[PDB]
Every structure is written in structure tokens, then in C-alpha cells.
Amino acid sequence: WELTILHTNDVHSRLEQTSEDSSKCVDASRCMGGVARLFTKVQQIRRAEPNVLLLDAGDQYQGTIWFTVYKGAEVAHFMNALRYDAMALGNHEFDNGVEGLIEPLLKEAKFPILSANIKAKGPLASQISGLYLPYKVLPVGDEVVGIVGYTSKETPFLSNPGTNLVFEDEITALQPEVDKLKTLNVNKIIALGHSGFEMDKLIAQKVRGVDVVVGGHSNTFLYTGNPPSKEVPAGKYPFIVTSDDGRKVPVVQAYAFGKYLGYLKIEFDERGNVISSHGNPILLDSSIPEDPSIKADINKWRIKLDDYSTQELGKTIVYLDGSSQSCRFRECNMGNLICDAMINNNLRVSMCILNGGGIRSPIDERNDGTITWENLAAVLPFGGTFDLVQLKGSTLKKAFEHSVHRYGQSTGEFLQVGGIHVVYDLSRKPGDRVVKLDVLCTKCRVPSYDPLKMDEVYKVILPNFLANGGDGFQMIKDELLRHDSGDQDINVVSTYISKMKVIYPAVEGRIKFS
Amino acid sequence: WELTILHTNDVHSRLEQTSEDSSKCVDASRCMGGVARLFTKVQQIRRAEPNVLLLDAGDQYQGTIWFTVYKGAEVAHFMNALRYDAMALGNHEFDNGVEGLIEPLLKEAKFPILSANIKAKGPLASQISGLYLPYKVLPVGDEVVGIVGYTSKETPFLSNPGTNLVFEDEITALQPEVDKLKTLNVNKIIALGHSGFEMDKLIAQKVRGVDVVVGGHSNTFLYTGNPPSKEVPAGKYPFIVTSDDGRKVPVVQAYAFGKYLGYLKIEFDERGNVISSHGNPILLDSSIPEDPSIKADINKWRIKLDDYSTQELGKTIVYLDGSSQSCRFRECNMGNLICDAMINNNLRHVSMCILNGGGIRSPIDERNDGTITWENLAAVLPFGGTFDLVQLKGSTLKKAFEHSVHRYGQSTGEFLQVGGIHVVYDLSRKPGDRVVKLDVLCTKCRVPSYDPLKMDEVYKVILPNFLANGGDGFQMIKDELLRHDSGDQDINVVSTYISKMKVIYPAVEGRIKFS
Ligand SMILES: Cc1cccc(-n2nccc2-c2cc(Cl)c3nnn(-c4ccc5cn[nH]c5c4)c3c2)c1
Ligand SMILES: Cc1cccc(-n2nccc2-c2cc(Cl)c3nnn(-c4ccc5cn[nH]c5c4)c3c2)c1
Ligand SMILES: [Ca+2]
Ligand SMILES: [Ca+2]
Ligand SMILES: [Zn+2]
Ligand SMILES: [Zn+2]
Ligand SMILES: [Zn+2]
Ligand SMILES: [Zn+2]
């Protein structure tokens, strides 16, 4: 028995087609993704293959003005139009709190929304009762396929799920659900969830009975053969895990931003065991037409977004590299721009720290360099503030150690900086990777870079998200000596752009590796 | 027979008292120098010692709005009021061309103006005939003292002397003059000139008959004992040179900006030979009152300068280190500010800048509520030049950086301040092979980043007009540039940028490093 799994993850409000770097589509002839194009490709597959599931591994929420304005109503509407079979809850589904998940998405989705490791307590349990499920058993032809969901345990430190939701360990929560499905004689099981490639591999290895893992969160690009675009594969597609019960378990992911449609054909035997699997993510480029009906509908919804001040904030003469591949791995010029905008606005303190996880998109310079509120809103969508903090040198050294504690998983804690020169030696044990850390002096008439002192006290401008233990920066929350509330993130950056008129941030050597 | 030599050099338009870093005087109680205070100290010495000479070793011209507005008329007036006995021509006396030297200073000075190594050719020879001299024989009591002048051979690469003036080798030019003085039975000889401490020492060693050398140009601070301020001595005061004809020759210098009055008391025998000498530069601090008559006169002249837009250009929250001790030796934040102002104004793609320490003329203090005015800025950038665009081979650029440190340690002007460049020097290496690392901001990239310079590659650089014209000995820029577009006015580029930024805070970032 053959099953085709079509899968998307981390779409992040890319409802319209985008540039290849997934920023605003300007040169339409080279644009990719969008729901209109995705619908065309899905329909081509559903008409050719009999047993097809369309799955989403979370993080449909947040990324563009579509979400800022429609707050999830666009997600329900277009996922319904595309007829998704199931979606796993991602961390970003909680960005507008539980009330922002329940009302526009859980109540309007015409498909099951899943998460086996999220448990509701207090008065909320009765409200959210049955709105999301641990699993769904779906009929596929004359067969039945069990889909069991999971959401990152880290969501309380990355989003706003509230206090009445408990995030259990994925493996611990999944095992009883898979076991229940086996007693219900459901012999084919897909674990669909949002915890990142490393947890996906662990789930594949340790949850007895899982046949396939469809993930997200890490924006992992997997490919078999020569890749069709700029994304570099982390491994083959599918990635094969050898389980503890001795089975070969395919693990798949499809990058992010709706640029690819994941495609895996699985051959099961009569007893539900995977004989083989093959596929590859499909590049949703210009050669695939945008469905006319979906595109007409997208255009209808776009009208309300066309009200956003098309007025130029200023110009960039350089590519503003706010891509995750850069900003979560190394010094990125968009990170330097925001940290210098933060420092500047405050003076109008010379040290700044900014988590890569909060830099959500690049901005392209080829449109006569024009930066609009729409371009910027995709970079900084969270509506947070840039706050002032007084920190011990030891607290800062610990924050920098945390910044690279699990380097290489495309996690959000990597720090972008201002007034700091940090050198990392990744070959060293986690918690001992910071080999050099120089900071801009304050008790000096002429600023210069001097080695950080553990027993010294520094004034730093950082997002309120980091002062509140976001991205696992518990040491900042627990050890800070002062915390003053600041100005709105996006307004700080637009004003600075309007003041500078022409911007050109560079990669200068603020962050180095040894 | 005893002679006291009082000497100033590199006053650079510091007619008014200044802060200790020789920028605008704000906190008067701690201010130093100025001509009013100098007059009090000179008077105290002239009334105590019978045989006194007051000498200037050049570079009275250029430094503050006093010169911008009065163009040398303030120099003639206040040097005359202080009754200088002689002045040597410095390179800065040529900043307004020969016509700017002749008309306000040579014609109005009530004292001889000297230079034995400057020769006039063409039609100019008849015009300047007798306006400056190779030497002057001055009566001092019942004795006569010969003073022979000299000016840096480098003046054509530093200023505007024109094409009708030839700068000969100092030693070659001085020897016939000293010999002529000996035949005129002038047995006491002072070489007063502007070529820098290293040449002063050479003059003392090799010019037969020179008893004392009084110099300038290198802003050398010499002191015997514990120094009274922040200037660190280069050697004892006087510095003793053992001449080739076996004599002990004192060499003196008195820093710059009118902060100190050089003071050397010499014991000569009957035949004019120095028996001994002793002294020290005198710190012109608050302990010395400003002469009331000179100060009243200074205030009278100040009125015309107040007319200068007292309006705030913007604010600094950091000390703008434009001191020569910094900008000619290492990365200085005033250098980074000007190079970033240059790059910025031009964009409002070129991301590389080079700026000689020689063109940075003063720091700016941040303690006056951070206020930057046109007067503060005019002291930093007084030359009225432009910031121009140049297309250079990597090899040309590597040669410029080698030149920047070819004779490092003499407080010469060729040291380069930078923008969009990270350069590392190893000074232990032979001159012409000191640049050990040179990374530049890419241009053929969407994201700018520092990549190693390539000898066969072509870069676009913003630099002063002066450097593109082979100023400071940068002959390789003039001769090898592939394109040279004229730019915007130096000072306007920097004020506009300050007005745009509102609050500035340049830093020392590691653009220049040593190994
Ligand atoms: C814990 C906390 C405090 C304050 C606010 C929040 N919320 N609530 C709702 C939304 C946010 C929020 C806001 C701001 Cl300013 C962020 N910047 N980065 N980041 C973020 C997001 C997702 C991942 C994934 N890996 N790393 C990440 C970082 C933000 C999340 C949470
Ligand atoms: C050769 C040349 C070209 C263009 C103009 C000039 N004149 N003319 C008249 C005045 C200048 C001039 C102007 C500018 Cl923008 C300068 N910046 N630095 N610098 C200078 C001055 C003195 C020393 C001593 N060591 N280093 C030094 C550098 C300048 C000289 C000459
Ligand atoms: Ca199975
Ligand atoms: Ca003699
Ligand atoms: Zn995501
Ligand atoms: Zn996620
Ligand atoms: Zn001078
Ligand atoms: Zn000079």
C-alpha cells in the first residue's frame, strides 16, 4: 500500500509568492512559493496519486503583514481552501496568546489541529476542550492512517502560551498516544510536529510504532541529489533513523516560507511496516502557475494590506541580510543595523545584544533601495521594545556561552551585537566556547575595546524578550541589576532609517570564530 | 658672557589661552598659553637677565579662526607686541602662498624673518628680495649674536610655496652662511629653524660653527627632571649633540601651541664657545597672570571672530581626539569621525577612506554640554580643501600604507587614519615592508565585508585633495591614480554630517593595529 505525504512547515505568513530569500516579491518572473502556487502543485499530485495527505508541521503564524492584519484568519481561510488534512501546532501559533490561537484558527480550521504534548489546566481546559487533539485517525482510501502531533517544549520561552498550558516532553507524551492507536489497530503512524530536526530524530528512534516523522522548527532542508536552489542540504531526503526497536524510520522536513512542497512516497506492507520511501522537496518556482482562483482570492484579501503606508522610510544600498541561515550562525549586517539603531535611538550606553530568533527576514536593495513599513514589519513583527539593562560581566559571559551552547541547530539564541567583539572556539565544550570578549568602555573619554571583566558592571540595550528570559536567557532575567522599559522595536528601526536616509550596514568582525 | 634664549615654535594661531590639549579655552581657571600670558613671562625674564633673545622657530601660521579671519595680520601684530627678536620661516607660513606670506607678515614684522635654504627664482626673486634673510646679526648688549634660519625641505609637499621657490638641503645651505658670519667676526651663532628634531640634531653635528640649534616642526618636548604637564619628554633639555668638530652643541625645542616658553641660559667664553647651558621649557599655566594690556588688545581683536555662527552644529558625547600625539601615531576617533563623515556625505558606492594625520589639527572637548561650533571644527580642518574620489590599484594602496609608517616615530604627518580598511603594522620590519595585514570593504558584493586587499585589484577611495596631489610625500597616489573626481569642501562635509547625526560618539575600533 502506497502513501504520498505532501508537507509544509514554517510557512510564516508567506501567503503571497516571495523573492527566493523569501522577502517581498518584487520581480514576479523570479518569485516563488505562495498558497496560489502551492495549490497548483498539490492538485497535480492529488489527481495522479490515489493515497495523498497534505500536512503542515506548524509555524503558519507570524512573518508578514498578512498576520499583523488578519491575525490567523488568513491561515484558517487559505489552509481550508488548500484542503490540508492535518496541522501540528508550532511555537508561533501561541504568539497572540491562547485567545489568538482559539478564535481565528482552532474555531475556523476545517482540518484537525494536533499536539499530544500540550495539556490544558485551570479554567482554560473546558474552553479549549476538543479544539486541538493528540492525534487524528484519517481514512486514506480503504486504509486508515494515524497522525500524532507535537509542539516544542520550548514554546513558553519563545511565545505566549499562557500559564494554563503545560508543555510535556515530546517522547513521554507521544508514547501513550501511539500505544492507544496500536490497540485501535491503526498500523500506520506519522508523527507530525514542531520541535526541530534533532527532536524529530529522537522521536524516530525512541517512540515505538512511529513509521514516519514530518517536522519543522529548524527550517531543515533535506535533499537527495543536486539541490535546485540556494538552500544547502543538511542530509538526504528522507533522512533515515535506525530506531531502538530496529526499524528504518524516514524523517522529513521542507525548509520554510512555503518555498518547497515536501514530497515523500511511502511503500507500506499489509501490516503497516515501511518497506521503502523516496521523494524530495519540490521547488515552488515560476514554472508552476499560481492557481487563478486562489490568486483572485489572495488579491481580494491583499486590498486591506495595500492601505499600509507605501511611503519610503529611507534607502539601503546594501542587501540587508536578515536571513536565519546568516543571523543564527554568524555576524549578519541586518543584526548590526538593528543593534546600531537601538544604541543610536537611545543616545538621541554603547553595548547591544540581539537574538537571531528575533530577526525574521532580509530586505532586498535592488528596488531602488526602498524600505517600507511592510519590508520592516517582516523583519521585526513581534511588537516588543528595546530595553535598558544593567548586567554583571559574568552574566554577559554566561549569555554569550548560551548564544552557542548548541550551535548548529539553527536555534534563535545566537546573538547579534553592538559595541562588543566576541570570538568563539566551537571545538570547545558547551559553556566554555567564548575565547575572547572585548567591550566598548564607558568610564573613558575615548571609547575603545577592552576585555570584559567578570566582576565589572555594563549597561546593555537588548529586546524586552531577552530581559524576560526569552530564548532560554534565564541568567539575564535572574541576574540583571536594573531594567528600564524602552521604545517600540520597529519604530526605533524606522526612525533610525529615516534619520540616516541612506543606510549601508556591513559585516565588520564583531563576531568571529577560532 | 651670559645669554638667555627664550623660544617658541609651532604656536599655530593659539593667540588666546587654550585648554591643556590646546583646544578652545572653556574652563579659564585651568587654561594655559596665549600671547597675554607669554608676554607676562617674557617681561619677568627681561627684567631679571640683561642679555635676552626671544626667538620663534616657525609655524605661527594656521590653527584657529584667528588665522582664518586675520590671515597673518594677528601674527605680525602680537609678535611685534611681544617684541620677538627673530623668526625662522616654517612650512605653514606658505599655506596662503607667497603672496599670503609677503603682504601680512614679511611686510609688517618689526623683526627679521629668516631662512638660509629658501632661494627665489623667476619674477618672484625681485619681489621678495630682502623680505626674508639667510641670517641676522643682532646686538645683545656689547656683543653681537648671529642667527641663521632654515625651513623644512619638505615644504613643497606640505604647503603652497609656489614654483618660484627652491628648498635646498639645510646643511648645504647653512654652512656658507655660518662661514660668512665667522669672517664678519660674529663668534656666537644660533641656527633657528623649522625642519624637525632629527634635522636639528644633524645641523648641530655637521654645521661647523653652530653653537645652539633652536627648532620646531616635530613639536618635540624636551625636559630635565619631572615634567610639569601631560607631555612626555623625548630627551633632556637641552639635548646635547657632540659635533663632528668635537664640540658639545645644545639642541632645544618647546613643544607647540604656545603652552610652554622655551628657556635656555648659555655661558659663553670671550671667543664665543659655549662653556655650559641649562634651562627647561616653562609651563604657561594659570600661576602666570595674563598681561592686562595684551589681553585687552586680544579681546578687541576677538570681537570680529565672535561674528562666527555661535550656533551649535551638533553634540559629541565623547572626547574628539584630534591631537597630533594620537592621530600621527595610532588610530584616533577624530580620524574615524572624519573618514565616516567623508564616506557618508558621498553616499548621501565608495566605502574606503584614507586621511593623513597631518590634516587633523586639533581635538574637540565634550565637557561643554558636548557643543561643537564652527570655531571648534575650523581648528580641526583649517585648510579649505576638498574630499575627492580616487580610483586606485591595490598595489598603489599598499605603497601608500607603507609610506604611512616609513619613518614612524618622528611625529610626521603621513600616518593614515582610515574608513572601510583594517590595517596591521609590524614596525620591527624594514621600512617599505611594515604592512603585515590589509583588509578592505568589498564593493562587488551585496553584503559588505572585510576581504584581503589584492595588488592587481582596483578600489575606489575617498581622500583629501591634498593626498591626491602628492601631499605628505604620497607621490604614488598622484602618479598611479586612474581617476580623480573633485569633491565637496572638507569642513562642510564634516559639519553637515555632525548636524545630520545630531549626537556623535566615534570610537577607536581596531581599524589600525600594530604587531
Ligand atoms: C518569553 C517571551 C517574552 C516576551 C515576549 C514573548 N513573545 N510572546 C509572543 C511573541 C513573543 C516574542 C517577542 C519577541 Cl520581541 C521576540 N523576539 N524573538 N522572539 C522569538 C520568537 C520565536 C523563536 C524561536 N526561536 N527563537 C525565537 C525568538 C520573540 C518572541 C515571549
Ligand atoms: C601639496 C599640497 C596640495 C594641496 C594643498 C596644499 N596646501 N597648500 C596650502 C595648504 C595646504 C594643505 C592643505 C590640506 Cl587640506 C592639508 N592637509 N594636511 N596638510 C598638511 C600640512 C602640513 C603638514 C606637515 N606634515 N604633514 C602635513 C600635512 C595640508 C596642507 C599642498
Ligand atoms: Ca507501522
Ligand atoms: Ca661660537
Ligand atoms: Zn518557524
Ligand atoms: Zn518554530
Ligand atoms: Zn607645526
Ligand atoms: Zn611644521
Same domain, residue pair B462 and B508: yes
Residue among A199, A465, A477, A485 whose CB has most ligand 1 atoms within 8 A, to mutate: A465
Residue type (1 letter), A284: L
Same domain, residue pair A145 and A276: yes
3-state secondary structure B329-379: CCCCHHHHHHHHHHHHHHHCCCCEEEEEHHHCCCCECCCCCCEECHHHHHH
Q: Is A446 on the interface with B (CB under 8 A)?
A: yes
Task: Say yes or no for a CB contact (<8 Å) between A347 and B505.
Answer: yes
Same domain, residue pair A412 and A284: no
Residue with cell 599655506: B95
Cα(A145) to ligand 3 centroid in Å equals 10
Task: Say yes or no for a CB contact (<8 Å) between B333 and A504.
Answer: no
In sequence order, the 6+-apart residues with CB closer than 8 A to the CB of A105 are A61, A72, A75, A76, A93, A113
Beta strands at A482-488 and B450-452: parallel, antiparallel or unpaired: unpaired
DSSP string, B136-187: EEEEETTEEEEEEEEE-TTHHHHS---SSEEE--HHHHHHHHHHHHHHTT--
Same domain, residue pair B284 and B334: no
Same domain, residue pair B251 and B342: no
CB atoms within 10 A of CB A341: 25
Q: What is the rounded CA–CA span in Å between residue A371 and residue A317?
A: 11
CA atoms within 13 A on the CB side of A7: 39
Angle of the A170-183 helix axis to the A197-206 helix axis, nearest 10: 40
- B70 touches ligand 2 (CB under 6 Å): no
Beta bridge partner(s), residue B151: B194
- Which helix (H) or strand (E) covers residue B380, if one does? helix B374-380
Please report residues of B whose CB lies closer than 8 A to that of A510. Answer: none
Q: What is the rounded CA–CA span in Å between residue A367 and residue A437?
A: 38
User: Domain containing B243: what range?
Assistant: 1-311
In sequence order, the 6+-apart residues with CB closer than 8 A to the CB of B307 are none
- Based on C-alpha coordinates, what's the Rg of chain B? 23
Residue with cell 578600489: B459
Cα(B218) to ligand 8 centroid in Å equals 7
Q: What is the rounded CA–CA span in Å between residue A351 and residue A399?
A: 14
User: Backbone dihedral region of B427: left (phi > 0), alpha (psi from -120 to 50 degrees) or beta?
Assistant: alpha
3-state secondary structure A323-372: CHHHHCCCCCHHHHHHHHHHHHHHHCCCEEEEEHHHCCCCECCCCCCEEC
Same domain, residue pair A474 and A379: yes
Q: What is the rounded CA–CA span in Å between residue B337 and residue B491?
A: 12
Same domain, residue pair A346 and A295: no
Beta strands at A385-392 and A457-463: parallel, antiparallel or unpaired: antiparallel
Q: In what order do the strands lie in the sheet with B212-214?
A: B135-140, B143-151, B189-194, B212-214, B248-252, B239-242
Q: Which of B289, B311, B333 is the last residue in one of the domains?
A: B311
CB atoms within 10 A of CB A160: 16
- A159 touches ligand 1 (CB under 6 Å): yes
Domain at A411, CATH number: 3.90.780.10
- B216 touches ligand 2 (CB under 6 Å): no
Residue with cell 580616487: B390
| Residues A334/A362, Cβ–Cβ less than 8 Å | yes
Q: How was this structure determined?
A: X-ray
Q: What is the rounded CA–CA span in Å between residue B84 and residue B53?
A: 8
Same domain, residue pair A329 and A267: no
Please report residues of B whose CB lies closer than 8 A to that of A507. Answer: 447-450
- Based on C-alpha coordinates, what's the Rg of chain A? 23
Residue with cell 648645504: B172
Cα(A33) to ligand 6 centroid in Å equals 19
Q: Which residues, chain by chain, have CB under 5 Å from ion ligand 4?
A: B 187, 211, 272
Q: What is the rounded CA–CA span in Å between residue A317 and residue A322?
A: 15
Q: Is B450 on the interface with A (CB under 8 A)?
A: yes
Please give the span between the terminal C-alpha atoms of chain B, in angstroms, as a whole number: 52
Q: Which of A259, A282, A311 is the last residue in one of the domains?
A: A311
- Helix, coil or strand: residue B494: helix
Q: Is A508 on the interface with B (CB under 8 A)?
A: yes
Q: What is the rounded CA–CA span in Å between residue B371 and residue B364?
A: 9
Same domain, residue pair A332 and A306: no
CA atoms within 13 A on the CB side of B511: 28
Q: Is A230 on the interface with B (CB under 8 A)?
A: no
Q: Which ranges of B184-228 does DSSP label H, i.e. alpha helix?
A: 197-206
Same domain, residue pair B135 and B179: yes
Q: Which of B285, B311, B337 is the last residue in one of the domains?
A: B311
Is the preceding omega at residue A228 within 30 degrees of 0, hence cis? no
Residue with cell 618672484: B124
Resolution, expressed in angstroms to one decimal: 2.1
Same domain, residue pair A280 and A337: no
Same domain, residue pair A281 and A348: no
Residue among A382, A409, A488 whose CB has most ligand 1 atoms within 8 A, to mutate: A382
Domains of chain A: total: 2
Q: What is the rounded CA–CA span in Å between residue A13 and residue A302?
A: 13
Domain at B215, CATH number: 3.60.21.10
